Design a protein around this ligand. Structure first.
Ligand SMILES: CCC1=C(C)/C(=C/C2=NC(=C\c3[nH]c(/C=C4\NC(=O)[C@H](C)[C@H]4CC)c(C)c3CCC(=O)O)/C(CCC(=O)O)=C2C)NC1=O
Ligand SMILES: CCC1=C(C)/C(=C/C2=NC(=C\c3[nH]c(/C=C4\NC(=O)[C@H](C)[C@H]4CC)c(C)c3CCC(=O)O)/C(CCC(=O)O)=C2C)NC1=O
Ligand SMILES: CCC1=C(C)/C(=C/C2=NC(=C\c3[nH]c(/C=C4\NC(=O)[C@H](C)[C@H]4CC)c(C)c3CCC(=O)O)/C(CCC(=O)O)=C2C)NC1=O
Ligand SMILES: CCC1=C(C)/C(=C/C2=NC(=C\c3[nH]c(/C=C4\NC(=O)[C@H](C)[C@H]4CC)c(C)c3CCC(=O)O)/C(CCC(=O)O)=C2C)NC1=O
Ligand SMILES: CCC1=C(C)/C(=C/C2=NC(=C\c3[nH]c(/C=C4\NC(=O)[C@H](C)[C@H]4CC)c(C)c3CCC(=O)O)/C(CCC(=O)O)=C2C)NC1=O
Ligand SMILES: CCC1=C(C)/C(=C/C2=NC(=C\c3[nH]c(/C=C4\NC(=O)[C@H](C)[C@H]4CC)c(C)c3CCC(=O)O)/C(CCC(=O)O)=C2C)NC1=O
Ligand SMILES: CCC1=C(C)/C(=C/C2=NC(=C\c3[nH]c(/C=C4\NC(=O)[C@H](C)[C@H]4CC)c(C)c3CCC(=O)O)/C(CCC(=O)O)=C2C)NC1=O
Ligand SMILES: CCC1=C(C)/C(=C/C2=NC(=C\c3[nH]c(/C=C4\NC(=O)[C@H](C)[C@H]4CC)c(C)c3CCC(=O)O)/C(CCC(=O)O)=C2C)NC1=O
Ligand SMILES: CCC1=C(C)/C(=C/C2=NC(=C\c3[nH]c(/C=C4\NC(=O)[C@H](C)[C@H]4CC)c(C)c3CCC(=O)O)/C(CCC(=O)O)=C2C)NC1=O
Ligand SMILES: CCC1=C(C)/C(=C/C2=NC(=C\c3[nH]c(/C=C4\NC(=O)[C@H](C)[C@H]4CC)c(C)c3CCC(=O)O)/C(CCC(=O)O)=C2C)NC1=O
Lengths: 60, 162, 48, 172, 162, 162, 172, 172, 162, 162, 172
């Protein structure tokens, strides 16, 4: 099954970008990621390590 | 903020395992040396006003031209902002001492420092001289390993400015 | 190293950005090997 | 993106017929004042740091709650983000000035900037005031007749103020 | 769409920088070239009907078998489609002339062209010959630099087809 | 470098396509603006000695606190290096004018600018003042489009410093 | 990748010198004839399918061994790669004719091309033959006096011939 | 994704029991009819361009508005996207036919196609009409008694009609 | 759930193409090999009870120590769990037979096998000996190609355990 | 090429696993279908010359204009190339029949078909007509499953050409 | 990747000729013995853990120096790598046995394996000994009469020995 994750980039991520920098272009904070079930755990834990805060995870 | 306990947790989480003896050793090492860092923090927090004023005067002495009409030193609000800036630097030094990590300094001064200084045309050498005075004073305000803690943090800030 | 710009494609984009981005993507990911028209993925780039 | 020429072409294509003589005349006039438009864009570009610094100084003198600890622009990183946001807004405004279309500013930035500022906790009226101060600072440089031949560019000032106030109202 | 100004602005935004000397020089070249291009667009908009009629007849002379019953060009509906298509091409050529960019032709004709013609079995050589006829009467109709602009846009279309 | 011709060709190549109308019109604009640009380069090259010595003197006037012993400007070697640096900036500005793109300025001055200045503790405001003086003198040496070209490149360098 | 201007600039930089008067004059001459250069580039670009078609036909008429089962252009894949190669070499020759310097070819088009052809087993002699055929077919369109003002464009013809020759020599 | 055998296994596992003899003999009968299914799938595959061309021809006969300026199939780009979508839906219908269940069709072709079309402005009614015309043409090509042995496959015809109608109903 | 048909569909879908000769012949082979696998499924489903009880007894014979107290085999609850597990294995092997694919086993037993056996301390040699018992039984309950089908799926399950 | 055995081994290899029951079942279906497939290849190889000549004649009947002077079918060399091409398609269909897959067609005809046909202005409809004739005639020959095997590959080629 | 069929086809295409009747009869043979080949491949697949275990026991009984400290199979990391390599080589042997051609083994498994092992420090003689031991173990299971109809499989035994010998010779 596919799971759509609406992640809001917040101050926890902004601090990390302020320290490490922007090796990639700056982007809006709110975007949605679509994952399979196999990938849902790694992608979600990765978003946590990046400091991003998920808003809603919807199944499809 | 990159406290050593925080870095322990982050590394263990990144490698996805529990806390093995390796980072327990580091957490212990922090927990023992918390005492010198905390006493250095208390000593700094007591003598804060004298340190701020002496840093300001050292800045004006090393850079006499700044205070003259037409540039940054002139204007009483500018000396007020100078005192406030050395106060901020000292405050985050105390934070980094009490937290046993450069985290407070990193995320409250160093992060975004160069762009701010460039945009407001503030010379980092002013603050380097102020922190040099603070280091000279804390060389005698503290003794023992607390002095080493304070000097490491003050010089981390100094190297950040340069 | 220096002359070619970094190709970035956000979700809103126009036609020329899309076509150039796909040219760069195929010229990188597939080696520098020629990818004939019978090999181009159409559903994948529709999803993109 | 979309340009004024591109906009006219799009409207003509929607009705599916050739560009009318009135449209061609307007676009010819646009190309005639293109030189003045280039000067206005160069004026915005060549003094962009000065514009940012003046707007920031006036804004922070106006609103000290951002400077003081606990404010939305207190630490160095939040100050740097403030300055970077002003800079990027100015850059998009100059893009709109050069193209003559507000699409380059409206498309990528202003749509999601609302949600971004709401999520981060920034005071939105503060950012709108920052953009208005940027407009006020930039008008002086746009007017500066030194090093350019004396001429009339009321259309350019009106359009630039339009882009500035549009971005400020969007973020507001 | 791909204009000179849009290439300017996209190259400037992609590198996160302002418009500068190279980009303003490109825009200045656009503004200088606008006069022949707007002139050619005007002259081509005047003579759209004669150009389209001649191009359709040119195709019919060049590919006589097409008009044969059971083929594509047989029937008034198919010839009306032919005239409509040549009019489409001419209109997008005028748009490209006005915009000083092949963005209109690209977006509205070239993108999707090969697959559509393959699906409907539309020989590109028909449109190439029709555009050749249009190129021929552009020489008579236009002179100076408007002539060159119109010819280069028509050649862009023909290169896309061929 | 990132001149008009080179960026045109590079973007054309990165998309695997020939040079279309947009690119050729940009190149035409470059070849037309060559005349004012080469004229500005001639004017500045003929007057390089007066321009550079005046710029050095302007710096020493706006920064009086530099010439005295104990800091950067004291000594014949340091002032010789001052003149050499401003000669570098002016050389690369004339190169930009000749090439009709900031490519020379970018590659030779702007890339690595802040790190080099920080490493050698060279205040960017010095070179901003020198370039402001050169801008003022080119206001008098040049007229018309030559002045606009020269000022455009000088302002590009100044914005890069600040 | 340089143009003529950047090449002159690089030499002047190595000397540590401003550009001499005669250098500026040669550069003003180059830019003053830039219109003919643009016309020649347009002639190469606009007729590129024709050039490649004619070169391909002549090459496979001369060398039938390329299109016989076991030849290097035998199946559709190899023939398509061959035509893409001709397309690419013509593209880069047009780039070099626009810039006026053959640095683009050795930097990009011919960077590792000979090694590529050796490792694939491509007959480099036939590739150089294909480039010569394209050169011949291109000269026809470069001298085409229709639709352009009559003038002396022999320098352009010689320069384009040298670009084609530099390619066919680097492959071979 | 899922199969008819895997459908039955899913029911068995949710029930928590072995496969019953009724379902199991049903699966054996499906296995025997699998050859008829192979002929049906090959009939769909071998004629996909013909089905698509017929469906699009009559679709743009019925609805001129899609191909006039302002229509949703107007430029070559949108027409190409249209024909690509026709191709995709037919391909997934053939997959569902071979599998024996309509699982793959929903799970891959039709998760979010409706809101995609809504956002893009595509009339879902015309898409469903195109899928219906595709069903008509595909049924024409499935009935073919030439080049295959004669028998009854009305089960296949019903199942394929249901797949086409399920896709069309998911569209709009 | 990977089967012959599922791989058929997955490949052609990943490539974005219609099913053609190759995977149609693959599906044909699957359909032809259905009937012996189907009737082998009949055979194993019919005799499930005797096979499960015999496999349990074979395990308790090859590992006598598990029976005595303090081990995993002591207790009626553990015994019922043994029978339940062997029944699960048999059910999923029949599912693989009917599905003409290893997908049921991969999805319902093999995925997560080692982790939970390590977590619940369930020695894989117990189930390996049970599956070897069932292998011996299907050696006699089936004949012809169905014997081979049952043996392949059983020993695939064994290899997954081993 | 991509023939049944090769997709089998390729999937096993990419997944880093041995060949399981599904893989061998697909292989077994391949080995069954080898009999009518090689029978069809034998029949087509035997009757190649008549099929090629008839297909060329069908092309010239459907597109008579091709043989007019100045058209692609004018002359003896052009029509000899026609015959060579039809022989090519027939050869690769027989290869695909032998190898039980579209690998030979995909690798020696379809890969690069459109670009080559576009560069030399070869109409795919000619090859559609030739392959339609080969289909009609292999209907007369090749009774049974051999007919279906042949038509699958003929249709793969035709679908590629469209 | 190649099997016997694609190999014959490629050879025939090299000279641009149809497949001869001799080649067709050879391929029809291969297809007819395909079922025996499938049983050989299944024997290799299903007994793989036993094959590798027996091979490992023999090899590390002969060659103690591997499993001593300082040997190349000493820690669990290196011993796991040893067993992994053995299973991968056996896997590719079974792939080649099903294919009837050895090209998959040469292209994938043995491409630069000797250079890899020389680089890592592995005794390639010990790897070759392990492959020979695996061959000896595999022949036992290949010759298993149980669970299969009796028949002649001497050619398959020779072919499997040939692929094992190829692997052993290529490695060392
Ligand atoms: C918590 C982290 C933090 C720091 C460190 C900080 C420093 C700081 N001081 C500032 C003002 C200033 N700061 C100075 C400092 C000068 N005054 C002279 O007496 C001395 C030579 C010298 C100090 C050694 C001056 C002259 C100004 C006014 C000019 C300006 O920057 O706008 C500004 C510009 C905006 C403002 O007024 O706040 C910053 C960012 N701000 C922060 O939020
Ligand atoms: C920087 C610009 C650039 C160039 C120049 C370039 C050349 C180039 N040509 C190639 C192949 C080829 N090139 C040729 C062309 C030759 N064979 C015919 O006989 C002709 C005589 C002759 C051409 C006139 C052929 C046939 C191949 C395919 C080789 C093969 O498939 O074995 C390849 C290998 C790509 C692949 O097959 O995946 C490259 C990279 N690539 C680039 O990115
Ligand atoms: C498409 C172009 C684009 C824009 C416009 C954009 C705006 C933007 N501003 C941000 C944060 C911010 N933006 C501001 C600026 C505002 N806050 C107030 O203090 C000021 C008065 C005012 C400036 C005029 C500040 C202070 C932050 C930091 C918030 C935080 O770190 O928590 C962020 C979060 C990312 C980060 O902090 O690293 C984004 C994405 N991003 C883009 O990609
Ligand atoms: C290298 C990049 C580049 C620049 C910078 C550029 C600017 C430019 N400004 C011009 C004059 C001008 N510039 C202006 C604009 C000014 N007039 C008023 O003072 C306003 C305050 C101000 C606008 C902000 C005007 C009105 C003209 C004269 C145009 C006319 O009416 O004919 C001209 C035409 C000079 C002539 O041929 O006589 C150019 C080409 N062109 C370029 O290719
Ligand atoms: C905006 C860009 C655009 C173009 C250019 C365009 C061309 C175009 N022409 C079409 C039909 C057609 N067009 C023709 C034209 C032929 N008649 C003969 O007399 C001539 C030899 C020849 C023209 C030179 C014919 C015969 C058809 C019918 C094809 C069919 O029924 O399948 C179609 C198929 C859909 C339809 O119109 O019903 C397209 C897409 N469509 C576009 O959206
Ligand atoms: C192995 C796969 C393969 C194929 C299929 C193939 C087809 C093929 N045929 C060609 C020539 C040609 N082929 C034809 C075929 C036409 N003759 C007319 O009488 C008919 C209407 C029609 C055939 C039905 C023609 C006219 C040419 C000459 C085209 C030219 O000279 O430009 C060419 C161009 C190079 C050459 O051989 O001279 C190719 C690539 N080549 C391959 O390597
Ligand atoms: C949109 C891109 C663009 C192009 C392509 C372009 C071409 C162009 N061709 C021109 C005339 C010319 N074009 C040519 C070149 C031709 N002479 C023939 O004999 C040769 C076959 C051939 C090459 C030697 C010559 C010699 C001239 C007149 C001399 C001159 O303008 O300096 C001119 C000058 C107009 C004039 O003074 O009449 C331009 C600007 N301009 C553009 O903005
Ligand atoms: C996962 C499988 C998959 C599906 C199902 C799929 C369909 C699909 N069709 C799309 C667009 C489209 N689809 C159509 C076709 C419709 N409009 C016409 O009027 C017809 C009536 C009708 C077709 C019969 C058109 C015209 C567009 C372009 C919309 C636009 O860009 O404005 C899009 C949006 C991206 C794009 O513009 O290409 C998707 C995702 N893509 C996939 O990867
Ligand atoms: C390589 C891919 C492949 C194909 C193409 C294939 C066709 C195929 N069709 C068959 C029979 C059949 N095929 C059909 C289906 C047809 N009957 C018509 O009425 C319907 C229009 C149509 C259904 C779409 C029927 C009804 C049979 C008879 C079943 C029997 O033989 O008992 C058979 C078995 C008997 C034989 O023909 O020798 C095969 C192998 N098998 C394959 O593995
Ligand atoms: C699911 C995967 C799958 C398998 C495993 C499979 C095996 C298989 N083995 C067969 C017979 C056979 N198998 C063998 C091989 C044996 N001869 C010697 O005893 C050797 C020890 C041994 C080789 C390992 C022989 C000789 C036959 C009889 C075929 C003949 O005599 O022509 C047959 C033909 C029918 C039969 O006689 O039962 C099949 C289908 N088919 C499949 O679809």
């Amino acid at each position: 099954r596919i799971y759509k994750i609406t992640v809001s980039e917040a101050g926890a991520y902004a601090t990390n970008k302020h320290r490490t920098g922007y090796r990639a272009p700056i982007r809006q904070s709110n975007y949605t990621l679509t994952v399979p079930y196999d990938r849902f755990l790694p992608e979600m834990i990765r978003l946590h390590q990046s400091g991003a805060k998920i808003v809603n995870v919807t199944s499809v | 903020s990159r406290t050593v306990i925080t870095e322990v947790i982050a590394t263990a989480d990144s490698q996805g395992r529990f806390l093995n003896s390796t980072e327990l050793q580091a957490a212990f090492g922090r927990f023992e040396r918390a005492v010198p860092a905390i006493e250095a923090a208390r000593a700094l927090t007591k003598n804060q006003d004298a340190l701020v004023k002496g840093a300001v005067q050292a800045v004006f002495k090393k850079f006499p031209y700044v205070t003259q009409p037409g540039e940054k030193g002139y204007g009483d609000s500018n000396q007020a902002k100078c005192a406030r800036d050395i106060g901020y630097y000292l405050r985050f030094i105390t934070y980094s001492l009490v937290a046993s990590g450069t985290g407070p300094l990193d995320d409250y001064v160093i992060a975004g420092l160069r762009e701010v200084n460039r945009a407001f045309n503030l010379n980092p050498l002013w603050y380097i001289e102020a922190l040099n005075y603070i280091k000279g004073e804390t060389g005698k305000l503290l003794s023992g390993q607390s002095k080493t803690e304070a000097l490491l943090y003050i010089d981390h800030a100094i190297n950040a400015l340069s | 190293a220096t002359e070619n710009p970094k190709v970035t494609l956000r979700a809103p984009f126009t036609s020329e950005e899309f076509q150039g981005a796909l040219y760069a993507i195929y010229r990188h990911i597939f080696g520098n090997t020629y990818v004939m028209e019978s090999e181009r993925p159409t559903t994948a780039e529709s999803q993109l | 993106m979309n340009d004024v020429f591109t906009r006219a072409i799009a409207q003509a294509d929607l009705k599916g017929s050739f560009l009318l003589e009135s449209d061609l005349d307007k676009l010819a006039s646009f190309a005639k004042e293109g030189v003045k438009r280039l000067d206005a864009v160069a004026a915005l570009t060549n003094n962009a740091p000065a514009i940012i610094s003046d707007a920031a100084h006036k804004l922070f003198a106006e609103q000290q709650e951002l400077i003081q600890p606990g404010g939305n622009a207190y630490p160095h990183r939040r100050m740097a983000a403030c300055l970077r946001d002003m800079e990027i807004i100015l850059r998009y405004v100059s893009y709109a000035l050069l193209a003559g279309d507000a699409s380059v500013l409206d498309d990528r930035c202003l749509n999601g900037l609302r949600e971004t500022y709401n999520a981060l906790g920034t005071p939105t009226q503060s950012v709108a005031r920052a953009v208005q101060l940027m407009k006020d600072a930039a008008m002086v440089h746009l007017k500066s007749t030194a090093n350019v031949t004396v001429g009339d560019c009321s259309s350019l000032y009106s359009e630039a103020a339009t882009y500035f106030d549009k971005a400020a109202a969007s973020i507001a």
